[PDB]
Design a binder for this molecule. Structure first.
Ligand SMILES: [Ca+2]
Ligand SMILES: [Ca+2]
Ligand SMILES: [Ca+2]
Ligand SMILES: [Ca+2]
Lengths: 66, 146
């Protein structure tokens, strides 16, 4: 005698989909504002930093007396 | 990639592979993270390896390291591309894409829309219910693999 009509089903779909979308929004924000460092990003940044620092030193010399 | 580009990867990789054996172990991953103030459990570090360990032999070799780095770069570039698109679509710059603005986007992309279609597009993408599409909402509409 009682089931959810297709209309009812669609209502449920919206609420849960909306729940999911807020979840995805929270996960993206946990991710940019977390304090737990990604070791891959960190290693790559440590590698990028040391490389720029070594290119800048060669550059100061190359510009030294011009 | 180019030769300098592969060099950057090798070096990034070497930060992990101290023993030079050409793979990175759970022990080595644990070590790198210990130098970051975190204390991962052996069951934890195993899952991290797991996330990158394509062939499933327990360690991360260099080609596997590549694939997952290229994928982190692709995600970075995608966020950048999504921000640029939002900026173009949000013509008045108020930080919200409106019906009128979406209609214009869609017309520019070759589609012929009714108002009921525009409203249903906005409504399905609309998370906070304000009837317009903000940046976070646009991100989910652009990254839907569904
Ligand atoms: Ca090793
Ligand atoms: Ca492997
Ligand atoms: Ca706008
Ligand atoms: Ca909205």
């Amino acid at each position: 005698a009682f089931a959810l009509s297709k209309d009812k089903e669609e209502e449920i779909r919206k609420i849960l989909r909306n729940n999911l979308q807020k979840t995805r929004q929270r996960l993206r924000s946990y991710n940019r504002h977390t304090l737990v460092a990604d070791p891959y990003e960190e290693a790559w940044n440590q590698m990028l930093l040391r490389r720029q620092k070594a290119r800048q030193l060669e550059q100061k010399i190359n510009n030294y007396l011009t | 990639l180019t030769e300098e580009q592969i060099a950057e990867f090798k070096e990034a990789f070497s930060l992990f592979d101290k023993d030079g054996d050409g793979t990175i172990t759970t022990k080595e991953l644990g070590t790198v993270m210990r130098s970051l103030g975190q204390n991962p459990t052996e069951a934890e570090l195993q899952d991290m390896i797991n996330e990158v360990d394509a062939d499933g032999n327990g360690t991360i070799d260099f080609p596997e390291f590549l694939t997952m780095m290229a994928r982190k770069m692709k995600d970075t570039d995608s966020e950048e591309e999504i921000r640029e698109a939002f900026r173009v679509f949000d013509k008045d710059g108020n930080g919200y894409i409106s019906a009128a603005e979406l209609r214009h986007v869609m017309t520019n992309l070759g589609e012929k829309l009714t108002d009921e279609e525009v409203d249903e597009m906005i409504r399905e993408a609309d998370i906070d219910g304000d009837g317009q599409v903000n940046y976070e909402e646009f991100v989910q509409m652009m990254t839907a693999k569904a």
